[PDB]
Amino acid sequence: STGSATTTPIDSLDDAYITPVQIGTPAQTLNLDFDTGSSDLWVFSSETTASEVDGQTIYTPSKSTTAKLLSGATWSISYGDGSSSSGDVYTDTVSVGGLTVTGQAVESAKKVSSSFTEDSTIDGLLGLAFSTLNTVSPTQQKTFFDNAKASLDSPVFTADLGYHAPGTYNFGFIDTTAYTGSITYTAVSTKQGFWEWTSTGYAVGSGTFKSTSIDGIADTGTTLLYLPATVVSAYWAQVSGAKSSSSVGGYVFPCSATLPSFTFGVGSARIVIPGDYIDFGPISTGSSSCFGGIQSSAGIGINIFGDVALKAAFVVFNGATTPTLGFASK
């Protein structure tokens, strides 16, 4: 089997992407944030504290003839941005772009933190990291991809995120029309539960490539590109007036600037992020200070190849017995 679904930016900055997902019988369609950096499929629901729902579409398990309470199971998750959610668990039928999994754990939120409430466009998350990170207790649950894998034509999914435009998540096949050149594959460590890999270096604008190993994660659920302080300083030094602002929480730059590109290495191959992809707009409405799309990972503990990086590529998440990542230009 295969599936194919369009993913759409939630706003004009590409802060995140939503993909429609059918849950239950009859189908309830929710717009979920597909997140290769976590492993829980959770939704706003009829159980979510009412004051914490503000415009989201909710899953109502009592209206699904295929929903079953997973007795005794609870979940609770905290994300790198400080947000969180928790609740109980049902199993139900879940379909993405024509690919159907029966018995998928659908984690129903009883509580969500303010950032989720405040984002009316995201009805939940669909985790696509390794199932070892799933938070369901006392019986850990599998991701949608893990459950679908055996049925797929090939044990892969691909992320093709757009810049200011829709893109595609495909399951079970590699669309050879969706990228240019060849796909370069690189090793993955699953030891931390992430799609963790080692970039071979970077370049700033037209500058020379610096060969240096940068371990990080391919994370569709993180907006920005978080890299070591040395690398980020080298990038922003090429932008007149750019500076790191402790009050804003990262590097800012004059909105009048034209930004240089940023290249990252995948083996001997190179992915070029156009400068425009690194502009995240005014820090507050009407400001002439703009927020940078490349930020330091020094306070995180891990480097993160988020959407800023991934949307410059066609990305293959290869879930073969030994997983690997593939990157192509597009």
Curated annotation (Swiss-Prot):
Cytoplasm found in the keyword field: no
Active-site residues, as the UniProt record annotates them: 35, 199
Cystine crosslinks: 255-290
Keywords: Aspartyl protease, Disulfide bond, Hydrolase, Protease, Signal, Zymogen
Reactions listed under catalytic activity: Hydrolysis of proteins with specificity similar to that of pepsin A, prefers hydrophobic residues at P1 and P1', but does not cleave 14-Ala-|-Leu-15 in the B chain of insulin or Z-Glu-Tyr. Clots milk
Domain Peptidase A1 span(s) in chain numbering: 17-328
Enzyme class: hydrolase
Gene Ontology biological process terms in this record: proteolysis
E.C. code: 3.4.23.22
GO MF, any single term: aspartic-type endopeptidase activity
Nucleotidyltransferase found in the keyword field: no
Similarity comment text for this entry: Belongs to the peptidase A1 family.
Protein name: Endothiapepsin
UniProt source species: Cryphonectria parasitica (Chestnut blight fungus)
Gene field: EAPA
